[PDB]
Assembly symmetry: C2
Homo-oligomer: 185 residues x 2
């Protein structure tokens, strides 16, 4: 069930087998217990001892808010991977999970989630023109932050491989993270 | 969201913030990357360096099949905790999650799950006598194993703090695990 090439490690930056590990907003970070856990859990070793052979997770999905802070941890973790386990990025293992930004509370249909303003307006338009009703004042929840949503509206919405919205991290993507980290010094 | 006293570490023995880490069926185990990850992730250190102060998870829930193997890993992990991090057990942090054993596929009502034969017969009886219909041949799924069920029928069913069925591990409970491990040698 939890075989290496059939499992994923999610890194929920707070502050199908899917493992979940947290990382909170905080270069001796390699000694932060949460980082060591994420690093240990990947099983590939680090720096010169990096061994793609011992990777235990097919996918490494990073989950945070692209609306808060500056992903100071999504840019902090990314740099860590880039200059300690870069092959994980190069071979396309790293990813970003976009949490839902909206919950359309249809009056009598299972709610729907939109991950972009555009998807909202279209889903609203689709639902309405399709005979679905929705309260005009508190019908559309604007998730400020993440996690503060609801377990299962966090699962069905971001862990569900079908409905989830994933965007792979490219070496270019990781390079910027590294620069921004450097510049934030 | 993921604060130490408000988060849990689930250990899914394969082969509210909830982190998930796997452990597969396999005393130098402390060098097994999955064990080191679980051990690192708890952040308390081990043996003489054990520090309840640095525990990062309020609850440590172990999830496996009480119908397969002999929880050779649930008895292996338990012993590890008992003789390397015993205070985690003593202070009532360890737990066992019982996966559902049955899925009552009601004809037109959200399915129901039973964790014991008794709960099955009663739910069936309740649903029927309540005007709900169910196919007599393939209406009641008998989960052989776990995980092979369905993501969200694994979540809503075992991660959901409301509906989940947890049973705390007592020092007595852990002592047996230790003996059985010893005897299995």
């Amino acid at each position: 069930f939890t075989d290496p090439r059939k499992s994923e490690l999610y890194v929920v930056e707070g502050d199908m087998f899917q493992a979940i590990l947290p990382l909170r907003g905080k270069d001796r970070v390699l000694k932060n217990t949460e980082v060591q856990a994420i690093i240990t859990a990947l099983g590939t070793g680090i720096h010169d001892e990096f061994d793609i052979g011992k990777l235990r997770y097919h996918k490494i999905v990073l989950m945070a808010d692209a609306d808060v802070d500056g992903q100071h941890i999504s840019t902090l973790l990314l740099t860590l991977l880039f200059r300690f386990m870069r092959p994980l990025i190069e071979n396309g293992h790293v990813f970003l999970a976009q949490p839902p930004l909206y919950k359309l509370k249809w009056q009598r249909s299972d709610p729907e989630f939109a991950y972009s303003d555009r998807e909202r307006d279209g889903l609203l338009e689709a639902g309405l023109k399709a005979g679905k009703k929705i309260n005009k004042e508190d019908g559309i929840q604007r998730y400020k932050g993440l996690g503060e949503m609801d377990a299962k509206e966090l699962w069905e919405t971001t862990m569900d491989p079908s409905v989830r919205v994933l965007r792979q991290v490219t070496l270019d993507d990781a390079a910027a993270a590294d620069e921004l980290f450097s510049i934030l010094m």
